[PDB]
Amino acid sequence: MEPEEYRERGREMVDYICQYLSTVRERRVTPDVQPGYLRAQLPESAPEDPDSWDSIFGDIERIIMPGVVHWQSPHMHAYYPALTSWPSLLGDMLADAINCLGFTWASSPACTELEMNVMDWLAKMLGLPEHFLHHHPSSQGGGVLQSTVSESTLIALLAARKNKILEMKTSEPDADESSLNARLVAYASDQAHSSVEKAGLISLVKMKFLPVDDNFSLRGEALQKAIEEDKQRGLVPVFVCATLGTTGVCAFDCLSELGPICAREGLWLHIDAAYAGTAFLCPEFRGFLKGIEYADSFTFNPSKWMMVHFDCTGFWVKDKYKLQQTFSVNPGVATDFMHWQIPLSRRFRSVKLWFVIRSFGVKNLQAHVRHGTEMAKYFESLVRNDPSFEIPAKRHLGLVVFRLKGPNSLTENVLKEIAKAGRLFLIPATIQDKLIIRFTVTSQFTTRDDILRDWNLIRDAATLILS
């Protein structure tokens, strides 16, 4: 296409997008498709000659959207949110067009510099300690963008195990890094995200999930008791992943207790705040951040609740030297971010993050978190009022968990009945013996009418199953 044609088709894609996002409630949230559905819809080989633009654009409705799960639907209530927004779209449009890479400062200074300043903005917005800021005069730390929390949590564990292997290597400089790795043990709550076990599997570091209390929170006592048992077995505690906003029921590990134990015992403390981190924009949700000063690293996803489209992960370290010795065989104004991550190439993700922060400003991002939380509090009060249902865990943010009283099958059957029309998207989880519906408030545009309408579909399905 000529530049003149791109200006038309760009306008055409903007108008399509504005309509799509504005009218998304009218879509079936989950597609009715079977695995393998799309192959008979596409040619077996790429086209030799150009397909016309009208044909490609036509295929968006004709063959992409019928298989999409509309994550931007207010009726999406599975997993955790992943929100886009207008500013976010416009930010990536520029980055995609410059298409620079920032493996080093030199390879595109703006890509590193904007990211450094904005991660400092964001650490401040969250109430993170000063020792995570690139520009605090005493800091050894800073923030870098990653693609996922999964990888951020893997990088934290690779930094923890390399650091502690290098310490142990000075008493045993004949011992193999990999042989010393065999003694290490890492811990997390038994509520931790699968990415914590996946980091263990990738790194061949032994990973132990610890029991939790009545609020599904990991406590000081359980970490301390595990550390004592494993040390007396000759294992070397190296790492804890403390989760602020667990996937299942959005519980919070007890940082004021886990922090001191990790510092005393020499364990790298890594905070998975994937979802809940966005809440820390608001002062009144910072209670769960108590003990943050003991963390060696912290990660959360703006790409969940903060209205930046995926990919966008915040990761902070207290000690960037420990991070870089993980990733470079030889171990605060500017840096080469290739030494803070797994790959070489990295793109200009800071543009969309910057635009979102600037376009909303901090107050409206706070208002968004408070609104989302009130919509979940509203949803909760509708469940709580209906004596067929029960709430087996506390709602702290935008996630309500509930179930029909009696056997699991009643809850299974309400889920199946709702899956027939797919007017909302729900996914079952389990907490102990209990099957539960997770209800995640998602879209920044969710209203109390959306909430009531989804509650009434759930109630109509419960009425069906109970009669």
Ligand X SMILES: Cc1ncc(COP(=O)(O)O)c(CN[C@@H](Cc2c[nH]c[nH+]2)C(=O)O)c1O
Structure tokens at 114: 């904007």
- 14 binds a second copy per the rule CB under 8 A: yes
Residue 447 binds which entry of a second copy, ligand X, none, with Cβ cut-offs from 5 to 8 Å by kind? none
Sheet containing 389-390: which strands, arranged edge to edge? 389-390, 399-404, 434-440, 428-431
CA pair distance 86, 93, nearest whole angstrom: 11
Q: How far is the CB of 39 from a second copy (least distance, A)?
A: 6
Considering the complex, state which of residue 259 and residue 398 has its C-beta at the smaller distance from ligand X: 398
Report whether 193 belongs to an annotated binding site. Answer: yes
SS3 260: helix
Nearest-approach distance from CB 194 to a second copy, in angstroms: 7
Neighbouring CB atoms inside 10 A of 447's CB total 13
| Binders in 359-388 for a second copy, by CB under 8 A | 359-364
Q: Candidates 85-93, 168-176, 204-212, 239-247 — which segment interacts with ligand X by CB under 6 A?
A: 239-247
Stretch that binds a second copy, among 105-113, 251-259, 264-272, 458-466 (CB under 8 A): 105-113
Residue in 72, 85, 181, 243 binding ligand X, rule: CB under 6 A? 243
Q: With respect to a second copy, which residue has the nearer C-beta, 3 or 287?
A: 3
- Burial class from Cβ neighbours inside 10 Å (0-12, 13-18, 19+) for residue 7 reads exposed
Partners of 322 in beta bridges:
none
Q: Of 299 and 411, which has the nearer Cβ to a second copy?
A: 299
How far apart are CB 179 and ligand X at their closest, in Å? 29
Which partner, ligand X, a second copy, none, binds residue 272 by CB below 5 to 8 Å per kind?
Answer: ligand X
Q: What is the DSSP string of 435-446?
A: EEEEEE---TT-
Quick one: what does residue 275 bind among a second copy, ligand X, none, with the CB cut-off 5 to 8 Å set by partner type? Answer: ligand X
How many chain residues bind ligand X (CB under 6 A)? 22
Contact between 205 and 153 (Cβ < 8 Å): no
Maximum Cα–Cα distance for the chain, whole Å?
A: 72
Chain Cα centroid distance, residue 245? 10
Question: Which residue of 304, 318, 320, 352 would you call a contact of ligand X, by CB under 6 A?
Answer: 304
Report helix, strand or coil for 242: strand
61 binds, among ligand X, a second copy, none (CB under 5 to 8 A by kind): none
Tell me, rounded to whole angstroms, the distance of Cα 464 from its chain centroid.
Answer: 35
Selected from 61, 96, 172, 213, the binder of a second copy by CB under 8 A is 96
Q: Which of residues 140-199 bind ligand X (CB under 6 A)?
A: 148-150, 193, 195
Name the CA radius of gyration of the chain, rounded.
24
Distance CA 300, CA 315 (A): 7
Judged by CB under 8 A, the chain residues 176 through 235 that form the site for a second copy are: 176-179, 181-182, 193-195, 197-198, 201-202, 204-205
Q: Are strands 389-390 and 399-404 parallel, antiparallel or unpaired?
A: antiparallel
Q: Residue 42 binds what, of a second copy, ligand X, none (CB under 5 to 8 Å, by partner type)?
A: a second copy
Distance CA 264, CA 174 (A): 28
Binding test (CB under 8 A) with a second copy, winner from 54, 58, 266, 345: 345
Q: Among all chains, which residue has been given the structure tokens 């879509």?
A: 27
Member of 345, 447, 456, 463 binding ligand X (CB under 6 A):
345
> Based on CB atoms, which residue is closest to ligand X, 345 or 409?
345
Site mask for a second copy (CB under 8 A), range 106-145, x = bound: xxxxxx-xx-xx--xxx-xx---------x----------
Cα separation of 147 and 399, whole Å? 23
275 binds ligand X (CB under 6 A): yes
Near a second copy by CB under 8 A, which window of 9-17, 250-258, 259-267, 386-394?
Answer: 9-17
Interface with a second copy, residue 71, by CB under 8 A: yes
| Identity of the residue, 114 or 431, whose beta carbon is nearer to a second copy in the bound complex | 114
DSSP state letters, 123-186: HHHHT--GGG-TTSTT-B-EEEEES-HHHHHHHHHHHHHHHHHHHHHTS-TTS-HHHHHTTEEE
Looking at the DSSP bridge assignments, the partners of residue 236 are: 184
Give the HSE-up count for residue 316: Cα atoms under 13 Å, Cβ half-sphere: 35
378 in a labelled binding site: no
Give the pair of three-digit tokens for residue 290: 């108590």
Q: Which residues are annotated as a binding site?
A: 80, 193
Which residues sit in the known binding site for substrate?
80, 193
Binding footprint of ligand X on the chain (CB under 6 A): 79-80, 82, 101, 148-150, 193, 195, 243, 245-247, 272, 274-275, 301, 304, 313, 343-345
